[PDB]
Write a protein that binds this ligand. Sequence first.
Ligand SMILES: CC(C)[C@H](C(=O)Nc1ccc(C(=O)NO)cc1)c1ccccc1
Ligand SMILES: [K+]
Ligand SMILES: [K+]
Ligand SMILES: [Zn+2]
Length: 359
Amino acid sequence: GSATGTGLVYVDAFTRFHCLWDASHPECPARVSTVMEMLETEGLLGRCVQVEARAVTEDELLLVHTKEYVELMKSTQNMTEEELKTLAEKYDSVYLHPGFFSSACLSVGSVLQLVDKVMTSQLRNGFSINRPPGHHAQADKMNGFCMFNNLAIAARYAQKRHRVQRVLIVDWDVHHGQGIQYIFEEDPSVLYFSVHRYEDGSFWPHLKESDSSSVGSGAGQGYNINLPWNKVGMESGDYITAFQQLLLPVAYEFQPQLVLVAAGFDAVIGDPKGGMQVSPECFSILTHMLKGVAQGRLVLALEGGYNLQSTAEGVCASMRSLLGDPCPHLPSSGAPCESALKSISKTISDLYPFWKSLQ
Ligand SMILES: CC(C)[C@H](C(=O)Nc1ccc(C(=O)NO)cc1)c1ccccc1
Ligand SMILES: [K+]
Ligand SMILES: [K+]
Ligand SMILES: [Zn+2]
């Protein structure tokens, strides 16, 4: 395929690691194989341009991560199960496996491949069907099922290799991507928007900096936007309203040259962790709402999502929009609930001093 195409990256290596000490761990290889099977069954896979993965290089990793941390992660490939468990336990909410590092390197590289093809007009947009996820990973630590911060690396790579000046990262996973926030906290060239379950800190990762008062600092003040949900059960209308009132006006003002999406599907109805009630079809609309900016240069990368069917359906819905199919009518009312409106209004109050579009 070519310029007006939608890229897809998937490699069998993404199934080559799993939790050795918890057979019920939610972050498991079926997450990606099920997505690929549904894309095929739906006839969507054959409409995409198959893009090869590549392994990230050390220098690419060092755009975000420390040399000491990269070397330590590299060494996990030669550690016994006991050593892997001891190291994993020094971080919050991670496991390790002898194949984790190799898959993590292909996970980062998959996004870089799509950035290359989108930025050079060889594709319109794309989706990497990758695990492990990335948005919690930090400069010198694993966190939240993540080793390397796929999208943070991709953003800095777009700036370094393709000389992009402004990148928008949209994170619709149900969890706050605090790793992305930290990496870009002082950086006005990367705008980070996250909508996430918070419940006044009750929900993991339990961080005060996941609240909307965290707007970035220094030159980056105004370029970090958190939308915390404080009740479970949010629906499509809550997300669409947030995008319409808050994200889209800011995004147009920011004028990004590339949009990267932390495309988790743990907010979809049925997810065992997220507690939300978003229909998979909503993600067709959310994807569509991001395509009118950055010349449509839009790259999605899989983050969380743990109900195999719900996550596969959410990926398929997003892919239909990437491919240009007209959006479905959504049955649920587009009106947001009172709690969602309260969070949106609060985030707007915290960000209005930095965005003319919010005044
Ligand atoms: C104890 C509990 C708090 C922990 C957990 O839920 N973690 C977690 C972190 C990140 C994501 C995600 O999807 N981020 O995008 C999802 C889940 C956990 C760990 C192991 C097995 C089950 C549960
Ligand atoms: K999020
Ligand atoms: K930022
Ligand atoms: Zn998540």
